[PDB]
Structure formats: C-alpha cells, structure tokens
Design a protein around this nucleic acid. Structure first.
Ligand SMILES: [Mg+2]
Ligand SMILES: [Mg+2]
Length: 208
DNA sequence: GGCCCTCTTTAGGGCCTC
C-alpha cells in the first residue's frame, strides 16, 4: 500500500515545461513546474509538494516567435521573477531526492503529457547547468497521453481531463502550473481508478 | 513553425507536446 511498492521503486514526479521551441538542444527553457505525489494509508494516490519556477533563457539560447506566441511568455519582461536553469532544477532535484528518501523509493520517474517533450528539455537543461546526480530516470517516463489513451480513450490533455470527469478551464490552459496540476490530478485519477476497479493490487485482479 | 488530409494542388485547417 506504499508508494515504493506501486511502481517498482520509482518515485513519480509530474513535470511540465514551457519553452521557446521544439528543439531541446537549442531552444530556451522558460518555465518549469513539478508536483511530487504521495500515497495515503488506504493506497490512494494524490499530489504532495508543488514547485514552480520561471526560467531565464540560457546564454545562446534560440527563441522561436511562434512558441512565444503560443505560451505568451516574454523572456524580456523584467518582472518575470525568472531564475537560472541551475537554480530551478537544483531545487527540484533536492525536493525530489528528499521525497525519494522519505518514501523508500530508488529514483524518480517523470510523469508528463507527451512526456518525451518535457523529459528531453529537462535532460538538456540539466546537462547545460552541469547538474550532478540527476534523480530522474534517464530514458523511462510515465506519459499521461498514453495512459489516458488506455484509461479514457483520449490523448489530448484537455479532452482526457474532461472525459475523466475533471474540471478543465481553457482560459488557464497552456500555463505551466495549471497544466502540471491538471496532469497530476489526471495521473492520480487514472491510477486510483485502476485500483477502484480491482486491477490493483494484483491479488485483487486474481479474484473470482 | 511545417506535415498531413482532403470538400487538395490557384487551400485551408487539424494537429494540440512549445
Ligand atoms: Mg506541456
Ligand atoms: Mg503547458
């Protein structure tokens, strides 16, 4: 009934990033939010700790106008409250390592919607920032797009949430914190629903 | 931004991770 037993020792952390393009190697990371998860005594999954950072474009970063048009971020607004990629990820890594330790897990796995996108940008930023002992799995992810495909027959984040009976506000979409929060609730609902229907634990699946 | 589909090509709009 513990978090460490649910995903073979992986500590699931929900991540959403905002960027200045689709190229993780060359395009700026502009924003990141992280949500750790916890399991109660009954084995139900729910959000734990929330982190959120506005990120300064790394020196020499490429910025695509169409991306900025999409996410509405102005990297030149001085009142952004932006910090370096190093600062943002160092704090996220610290909180995640603390969570891994306390929960008895072995390492973290990124939960994200179309997770390869966020995973690729996180790894790139961590490499640029020279961060060491990255607690995230270097290639495995929990993609909520695929999970929603299974659980709900939908792959688009907004539609998956709506289909799951969740609230989803289009006026708040495409903002990092809101997207991460909805993705975390969606992941938790998918996992909890599997348990409600008797698919987990495996002993329950074997009944009748 | 650009590939893809089609009620296509002398084009528009869906895609839905930025
Ligand atoms: Mg996203
Ligand atoms: Mg987003």
């Amino acid at each position: 009934t513990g978090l460490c037993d649910r995903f073979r020792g992986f500590y699931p952390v929900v991540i959403d990033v905002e960027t200045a393009g689709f190229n993780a190697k060359t395009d700026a990371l502009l924003e990141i939010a992280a949500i750790t998860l916890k399991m109660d005594e009954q084995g139900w999954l729910m959000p734990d700790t929330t982190l959120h950072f506005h990120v300064e474009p790394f020196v020499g970063a490429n910025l695509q106008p169409e991306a900025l048009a999409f996410n509405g971020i102005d990297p030149n607004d001085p009142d952004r409250g932006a910090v370096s990629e190093y600062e943002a990820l160092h704090e996220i890594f610290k909180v995640v390592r603390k969570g891994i330790k306390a929960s008895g897990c072995n390492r973290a796995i990124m939960v994200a919607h179309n997770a390869n996108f966020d995973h690729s940008f996180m790894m790139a930023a961590a490499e640029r920032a020279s961060l060491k002992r990255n607690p995230f799995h270097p290639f495995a992810t929990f993609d909520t797009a695929a999970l929603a495909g299974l659980a709900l027959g939908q792959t688009v984040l907004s539609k998956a949430c709506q289909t799951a009976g969740m609230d989803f506000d289009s006026t708040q979409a495409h903002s990092a914190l809101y997207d991460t929060e909805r993705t975390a609730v969606l992941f938790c609902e998918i996992v909890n629903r599997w348990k409600r229907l008797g698919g987990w634990p495996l002993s329950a699946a074997e009944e009748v």
